[PDB]
Design goal:
Blueprint: H1 12-18, H2 20-25, H3 28-34, E1 38-42, E2 45-49, E3 56-60, E4 63-67, H4 71-80, E5 86-91, E6 101-107, E7 112-117, E8 121-127, H5 148-151, E9 155-160, E10 170-175
Antiparallel strand pairs: 1-4, 1-10, 2-3, 4-8, 5-6, 6-7, 7-8, 9-10
Length: about 180
């Protein structure tokens, strides 16, 4: 309702540069509370958004996965560890078809960070609000995205075996370096 309107938001490039690493940090407590590490499930990407003169770009961040915890304990964690930029904490009223239940962290732009509970794991995904730019539209691949080093400053990349010993091992994040 009182989200910062589109024109007054920072540019997609400014957001990638300065907000995205802050946003990515909120996954860390989820891995810390487990007593372990995040697995990198997905890489970040940009996509087109908006319509007319409010056309711009949106940034989906890294998707990271921590081991599971009871939903009640996750809501406790997310709420108690709530960052300043988060204007609201939304909790899904029910588990959906896939046996997943979400908690959303809403920023002042109307953008989003989602903790997806499931019995197997907890996925942390980000999806910014639509952002303006002086750059060409309909070309989301033009924008450089931060390395996982930059997105998770206090962490360093390691590689662990896949939980199911099939396919490639997976990239993991652990604290330090």
């Amino acid at each position: 309702a009182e989200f910062v309107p589109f024109p007054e938001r920072v540019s997609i490039e400014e957001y990638i540069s300065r907000q995205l690493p802050e946003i990515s940090s909120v996954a860390v407590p989820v891995a810390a509370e487990t007593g372990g590490e995040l697995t990198v499930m997905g890489l970040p990407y940009v996509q087109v958004c908006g319509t007319g003169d409010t056309q711009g770009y949106r940034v989906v961040g890294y998707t990271t996965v921590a081991p599971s915890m009871s939903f009640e304990r996750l809501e406790k964690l997310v709420t108690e560890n709530k960052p300043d930029w988060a204007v609201a904490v939304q909790v899904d009223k029910q588990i959906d078809r896939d046996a997943t239940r979400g908690i959303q962290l809403i920023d002042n732009y109307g953008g989003l960070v989602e903790f997806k509970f499931s019995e197997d794991s907890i996925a942390v995904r980000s999806r910014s609000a639509c952002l303006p730019t002086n750059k060409p539209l309909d070309d989301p691949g033009q924008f450089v995205l931060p390395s996982v080093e930059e997105a998770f400053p206090g962490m360093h990349v390691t590689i662990s075996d896949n939980t199911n010993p099939d396919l490639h091992p997976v990239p993991t994040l652990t604290t330090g370096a």
